[PDB]
Ligand binder design. Structure first.
Ligand SMILES: [Cl-]
Ligand SMILES: [Cl-]
Ligand SMILES: [Cl-]
Ligand SMILES: [Cl-]
Ligand SMILES: [Cl-]
Ligand SMILES: [Rb+]
Ligand SMILES: [Rb+]
Ligand SMILES: [Rb+]
Ligand SMILES: [Rb+]
Lengths: 16, 16
């Protein structure tokens, strides 16, 4: 859990 | 729903 690539908040594909 | 900022898959804070 923390920063880098995976699932959660930030940039990429999903909702917003 | 799509690409940009928000939640889901890609780069930022959460789970790897
Ligand atoms: Cl797109
Ligand atoms: Cl942006
Ligand atoms: Cl949120
Ligand atoms: Cl946190
Ligand atoms: Cl994970
Ligand atoms: Rb993410
Ligand atoms: Rb993300
Ligand atoms: Rb997004
Ligand atoms: Rb991560």
């Amino acid at each position: 859990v923390g920063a880098x690539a995976x699932v959660x908040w930030x940039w990429x594909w999903x909702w917003x």
